[PDB]
Amino acid sequence: AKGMSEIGNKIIAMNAVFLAEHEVVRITNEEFVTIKREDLKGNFDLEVDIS
Amino acid sequence: AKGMSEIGNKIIAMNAVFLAEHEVVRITNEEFVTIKREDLKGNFDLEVDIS
Amino acid sequence: VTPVTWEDVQGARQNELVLNYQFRTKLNRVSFIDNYVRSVVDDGTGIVRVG
DSSP assignment of B33-48 equals ----GGGGGS-SSEE-
C3 three-state secondary structure: strand
- Residues in A closer than 8 angstroms to B26, CB to CB, are 39, 42, 44
Top residue of C6, C17, C18 to mutate, by most chain B CBs within 10 Å, is: C18
Name the experimental technique. Answer: cryo-EM
φ, ψ of residue B46 in degrees (nearest 5): -135, 150
Q: Can you tell me the distance from the alpha carbon of A8 to that of C26, in angstroms, rounded to the nearest whole number?
A: 16
Touching subunits for chain B (3+ Cβ pairs under 8 A): A, C
DSSP state of C11: H
Report how far apart, in Å, the C-alpha atoms of A30 and of each of A20, A23, A25, C40 are: 14, 12, 6, 51
The reported resolution of this PDB entry, expressed in Å, is: 3.7
C3: left (phi over 0), alpha (psi -120 to 50) or beta: beta
In chain C, the residue whose alpha carbon lies closest to the alpha carbon of B16 is: C15
Nearest by CB: A42 against C25, C28, C30: C25
Is the Cβ–Cβ distance between B9 and B48 less than 8 Å? yes
Angle between helices C9-21 and B2-18 (to 10 degrees): 100
Q: Which residue of C has its CA nearest to A44?
A: C21
Q: How far is A33 from chain C (nearest CA, A)?
A: 23
